[PDB]
Amino acid sequence: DLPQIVVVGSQSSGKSSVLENIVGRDFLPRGQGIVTRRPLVLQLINRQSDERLADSTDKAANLDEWGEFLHLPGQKFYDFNKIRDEINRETEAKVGRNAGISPAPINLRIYSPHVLNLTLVDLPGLTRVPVGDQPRDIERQIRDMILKYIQKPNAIILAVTAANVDLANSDGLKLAREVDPEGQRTIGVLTKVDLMDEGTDVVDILAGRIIPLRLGYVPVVNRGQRDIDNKKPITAALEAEKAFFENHKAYRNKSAYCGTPYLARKLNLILMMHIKQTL
Ligand SMILES: Nc1nc2c(ncn2[C@@H]2O[C@H](COP(=O)(O)OP(=O)(O)O)[C@@H](O)[C@H]2O)c(=O)[nH]1
Ligand SMILES: [Mg+2]
Predict the structure, then answer these.
(1) Where does GDP bind (predicted)?
(2) 37 lines ligand 1 (CB under 6 A)
(3) Domain containing 183 — which CATH number?
């Protein structure tokens, strides 16, 4: 149907962290062995610019930003800690906790003056060894779920790989190549650039010398686990990401092509081009 950006990669590649960095505020459940177990179809809606904010545990809530769930019609979520709770609820309701997965999507809209018009689909990450109560063929079930999404020619494939692993072992690029070998609709993200072995960088990847992608790669820096535990706001994380690329010798002169702000503009631009070619 409509074009959308499907986020694919290994478990703990940083897929959920990228979505939070794009939104600008944290709203996804994490910790306690919690991972994405249902597709989150996230629709971001730009919207240029009190009793409704009375019972808010989110210090940043405001009337210009809120979320809406398709299965909870009429409700507007101004507190993003309740968005997290509801996502955790809907997931456990259909697939319990730390068990298998379900293809039933959770549909969430978020209005904001700070987001571009994008549709992103967070998919479960590939793992290799079952833990907890997972079915022993959990790897196959996740692969088959991903392929069903990215086989569709309207799907823009956001292949997420951690920069502190060998690019050639990327699950995201493998799956992207299986359905889109020419790279016509695959765009890469390189996370955890701040965790790279000292002396290494991703410049060779950006210059197309390893696994070329015509739509390119974008390096980013999301919140680390310490930042999550300390409740560091995404706004501060974005400031930290900007400073990282502007003071690193390898990225200083190319920093306009680094970071989540550029990724969002790039996804928005690619998404508009993809629509133009639909008749
Ligand atoms: N230092 C650092 N940690 C990151 C970065 N991106 C993600 N992480 C951490 O990597 C872990 C997995 O990230 P997450 O978004 O939950 O992974 P997912 O399973 O792909 O959605 C978490 O502990 C994140 O804090 C990054 O750019 N830098
Ligand atoms: Mg995830």
Answers:
(1) 12-17, 30-31, 192, 194, 197, 222-223
(2) no
(3) 3.40.50.300
